[PDB]
Design a protein around this nucleic acid. Structure first.
Lengths: 159, 292, 102, 102, 169
RNA sequence: GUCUACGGCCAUACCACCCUGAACGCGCCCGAUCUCGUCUGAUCUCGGAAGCUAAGCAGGGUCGGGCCUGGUUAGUACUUGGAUGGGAGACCGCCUGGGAAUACCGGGUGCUGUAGGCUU
RNA sequence: CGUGGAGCAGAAGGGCAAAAGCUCGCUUGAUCUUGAUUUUCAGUACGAAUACAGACCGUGAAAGCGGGGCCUCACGAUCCU
RNA sequence: GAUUAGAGGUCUUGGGGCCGAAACGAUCUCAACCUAUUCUCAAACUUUAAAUGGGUAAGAAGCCCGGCUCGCUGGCGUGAG
């Protein structure tokens, strides 16, 4: 019902989960963020200075500015049917890395190593990620018994 | 009548403080603001000059911040001074100063910064500034790391500071707490500071006991006689220690003896042992009760 | 009232049932099998709609089941205390009381 | 004042409590939920007779009172005065509004 | 055995709650000063109770704490009044006991009309070496679980040391 | 084996109680002239090193509570999608896919980076 | 004994336990000056807020923190004076 | 936060007591206050916690190399170009 309010409906969102109401563990401060690696935005509550707005709680986008102790972030805000590439500032206590890209980078390293090894052996293996194919034709050994007879349970009443 | 608070509910809703913050050895409010560097530089370490003084020893360390642990750049304790001739004096302000000097010159030598960047043996009221470059050393600044928060005018946590700076570390500090200043005088003379650095006050305490009560003197200063200490050398052995420290502040660590391999404590109990011990404790005493 | 801001105010107080709820449990001596349902069937005529009646497979208002309950009591894992019976697991620190007399 | 439970039968709203925000609710007509020899030990009455509701609806406290009395009179008639323990196991907490019209 | 566990004096807390505000407490503080020999301090009120004649911050009581040799000095000097006698209930749940006394002249000060008739309390806290471990700053824990004292374990010290006996009541 | 300083995870690390102690390692502990601050050298601070491991601390014990992790709870509750499926309604069955949480019964009870000792 | 059961100017929600509460000590960063961004949306302004930069400063040993209130409300165009 | 019920036990009071004197005394007791349980709840409660949901990535704007510039950051380095 209500309209504009900088934090509406964030009673549970910014809430420092269900036991960790303590001070900020320092590793989140001590992590190294650089220009152009994919962070993601999850707002804390204890910081009290520099929160992303609740529209950006969960979205994730590139990082392009690095201040003393707060980074700028480019994220895609949904609005009426256009999609905006908006830029914000966030104190570094609300951001964290996102394994989404890091896993891709690891599999890039294995792809390139495999390509080099194909150079060495002359054989063209299949490079990454053929999707999940249907099952193969296999023999199920039944030595041990004849299969169990399975039969419906008659009704009973447990109120 | 009686209401309890340590119940299943209260434990279920408990919240455990940090390890250090819980056993009471660290303040994180200080640490967070003290040992992180701005994200503009991303990896320029923020060296800390840890100082911590026990009831039997003084420890100066140079560390910094890493995602896993805290890399100790260097360490120097106050119980090793017999290498340099400081026998008695373990948590004296003079001992702290000498330990700080040891750490400073040790660090500069490890970096090859000892042929330059000498402080001074004698009194001072200041640090020593230098000029900074790339590729070759220009300076070395480590931010002080005191105790939890406690300091008043004249503490050895400042004594180690004075030792380090007189050894040649650029450290942000305006000296309004070293022994040698009083809040009402508002101007420090630093001659009293040299007196504390060389322990001349300790010498006066010795003399005060000497001409008051030999019994009380010995009962306060026993090991001093056993070392055969004189108040006369207590202002010069320190100086020659200040020479020896800058003569060679590099550590020469020791061997290790073979292991007796068997003891500190009580290896934990096996599962079957823990599962049949209750069986015995029930059944055996049970058959005894039924004997009765 | 005139709908210009209509919103009711408290009146009466009801309870919400669920398919499979238990609106009334009567406990008595087994001899009263045909008094229990005979009487209880009247409530079917005071409540709205239809409510199946039923005879429990349990000893009483206990969590438990058919009368192996009393065997378990003999084993002392169930302690008769109050309108219900108190459960006892084999956990707990009384590994000397269970010795002295279980 | 009739307002027969026809109107307020179906469950149709977010469950109100007697809350800090709804004040002055009329007290549920039914108040005491245990009748008969309710001090009995468990070993006495080995029979529990239930009653399950087969419709998703609302039951009115007034109705609960009438039902409990009607089911207690008969079973006093048959079993006696210390022969049972009738325990209503349902509680009216969901209040309902009434919009007075001019 | 060994001085490991020996009970020893921890503190003696003495105070006066004059229940007014003017010169009365000003003279009471003087009485405590003459007795102990060190300047005492004052406690105001926390709440307001018109029923007793106090308001928030009402400057009510004068108190002080004593440690070391003077503790036994004053303890015995007062206990001569009761000539070494207390009661069971006077030993609290942590072996620290109390008793109040009505006047001040049998504590060796002459009746001074410039002052009045003042009475003062006496609450003694016993202890062992190694209770201060729970008031430190460098690192802090408990006093342990079996390193403590209780009512009977303070009665032992009272009966042995000052010979005072205890009346069932 | 294990301790010391700084830590990262911040309960498999907490709490309770009993037992055990591989230096002077931490610490208790003895004093207050110097520095400092309190009503109290209790705290803080300083100077010490006679005894002490009684305590903290470390390790262990607990048919311990707690906590973490498994089962049973259950393919139940629940729901994306479908119908000219039933029911007067309240609700409900089915096709298709997803799929929980108590009660209850198991197991576990700190790991570890860094710089520094010792084998009492 | 004491896991926030209290206090944080006020509604409620969030947040806090060597603090963001309580007591002291010192002080005016409640100041001067461009641009950027968030907040409502036409992605106009006002309001409010975010993070940097250039000056003068404050406190603290210092690391740092501070450009109003612990965060979410507490306020205003052309013309004219 | 609301709420039924029994129990097991001392305590703070009360009904009338008694003792004979106050006794909540042994008898009580009735409540209260605990301690284990017990029946039913929450749009403005919550330890748990789905289905359908919202973001990002799934390679040349990439990866590996080599050398300069930087009035910035400063052990030596960093990062940025």
């Amino acid at each position: 019902t209500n309209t504009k309010g900088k934090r509406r409906g964030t009673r549970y969102m910014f809430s420092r989960p269900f036991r960790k109401h303590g001070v900020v563990p320092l590793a989140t401060y001590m992590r190294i963020y650089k220009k152009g690696d994919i962070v993601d935005i999850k707002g804390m509550g204890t910081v009290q200075k520099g929160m992303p707005h609740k529209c950006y709680h969960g979205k994730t986008g590139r990082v392009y500015n690095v201040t003393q102790h707060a980074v700028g972030i480019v994220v895609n805000k949904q609005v009426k049917g256009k999609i905006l590439a908006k830029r914000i500032n966030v104190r570094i206590e609300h951001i964290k890395h996102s394994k989404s890209r890091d896993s891709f980078l690891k599999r890039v390293k294995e792809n390139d190593q495999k390509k080099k090894e194909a150079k060495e052996k002359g054989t063209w293996v299949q490079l990454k990620r053929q999707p999940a194919p249907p099952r193969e034709a296999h023999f199920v050994r039944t030595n041990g018994k004849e299969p169990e007879l399975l039969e419906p349970i008659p009704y009973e009443f447990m109120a | 009548f009686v209401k309890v608070v340590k119940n299943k509910a209260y434990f279920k809703r408990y919240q455990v403080k940090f390890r250090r913050r819980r056993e009471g050895k660290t303040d994180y409010y200080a640490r967070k603001r003290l040992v992180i560097q701005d994200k503009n530089k991303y990896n320029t370490p923020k060296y800390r000059m840890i100082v911590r003084v026990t009831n039997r020893d003084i420890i100066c360390q140079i560390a910094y911040a890493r995602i896993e642990g805290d890399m100790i750049v260097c360490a120097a304790y106050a119980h090793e001074l017999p290498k340099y001739g400081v026998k008695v004096g373990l948590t004296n302000y003079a001992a702290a100063y000498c330990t700080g000097l040891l750490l400073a010159r040790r660090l500069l030598n490890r970096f090859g910064m000892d042929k330059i960047y000498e402080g001074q043996v004698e009194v001072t009221g200041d640090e020593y500034n230098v000029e900074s470059i790339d590729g070759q050393p220009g300076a070395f600044t480590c931010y002080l790391d005191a105790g939890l928060a406690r300091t008043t005018t004249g503490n050895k946590v400042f004594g180690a500071l004075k030792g380090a700076v007189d050894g040649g570390l650029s450290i942000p500090h305006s000296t309004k707490r070293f022994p040698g200043y009083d809040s009402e005088s508002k101007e420090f003379n630093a001659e009293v500071h040299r007196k504390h650095i060389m322990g001349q006050n300790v010498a006066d305490y010795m003399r005060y006991l000497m001409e008051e009560d030999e019994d009380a003197y010995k009962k306060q200063f026993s090991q001093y006689i056993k070392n055969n200490v004189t108040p006369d050398m207590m202002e010069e052995m320190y100086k020659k220690a200040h020479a020896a420290i800058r003569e060679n502040p590099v550590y020469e660590k020791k061997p290790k003896r073979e292991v007796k391999k068997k003891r500190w404590n009580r290896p934990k109990m096996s599962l079957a042992q823990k599962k049949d011990r209750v069986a015995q404790k029930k059944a055996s005493f049970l058959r005894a009760q039924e004997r009765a | 009232t005139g709908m210009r801001g209509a919103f009711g105010k408290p009146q009466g107080t009801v309870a919400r049932v669920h398919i499979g709820q238990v609106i009334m449990s009567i406990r008595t001596k087994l001899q009263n099998k045909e008094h229990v349902v005979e009487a209880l069937r009247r409530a079917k005529f005071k409540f709205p709609g239809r409510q199946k009646i039923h005879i429990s497979k349990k000893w009483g208002f206990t969590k438990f089941n058919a009368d192996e309950f009393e065997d378990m009591v003999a084993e002392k894992r169930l302690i008769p205390d109050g309108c219900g019976v108190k459960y006892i697991p084999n956990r707990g620190p009384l590994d000397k009381w269970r010795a002295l007399h279980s | 004042g009739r307002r027969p439970a026809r109107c307020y039968r179906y469950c149709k709203n977010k469950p109100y409590p007697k809350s800090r925000f709804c004040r002055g609710v009329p007290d549920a007509k039914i108040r005491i939920f245990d009748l008969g020899r309710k001090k009995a030990k468990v070993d006495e009455f080995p029979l529990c007779g239930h009653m399950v509701s087969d419709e998703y609806e609302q039951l009115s406290s007034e109705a609960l009172e009438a039902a409990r009395i009607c089911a207690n009179k008969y079973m006093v008639k048959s079993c006696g005065k210390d022969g049972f323990h009738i325990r209503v196991r349902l509680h009216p907490f969901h209040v309902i509004r009434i919009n007075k019209m001019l | 055995e060994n001085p490991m566990r020996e009970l020893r004096i921890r503190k003696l807390c003495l105070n006066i709650c004059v229940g007014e505000s003017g010169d009365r407490l000003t003279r009471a503080a003087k009485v405590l000063e003459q007795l102990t020999g060190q300047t005492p301090v004052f406690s105001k009120a926390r709440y307001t109770v018109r029923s007793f004649g106090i308001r928030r911050n009402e400057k009510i009581a004068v108190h002080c704490t004593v440690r070391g040799a003077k503790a036994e000095e004053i303890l015995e000097k007062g206990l001569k009044v009761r000539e070494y006698e207390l009661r069971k209930n006077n030993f609290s749940d942590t072996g620290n006991f109390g008793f109040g006394i009505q006047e001040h002249i049998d504590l060796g000060i002459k009746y001074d009309p410039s002052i009045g008739i003042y009475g003062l309390d006496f609450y003694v806290v016993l202890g062992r070496p190694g209770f201060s471990i729970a008031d430190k700053k460098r690192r802090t824990g408990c006093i342990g679980a079996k390193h403590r004292i209780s009512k009977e374990e303070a009665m032992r010290w009272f009966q042995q040391k000052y010979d005072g006996i205890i009346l069932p009541g």
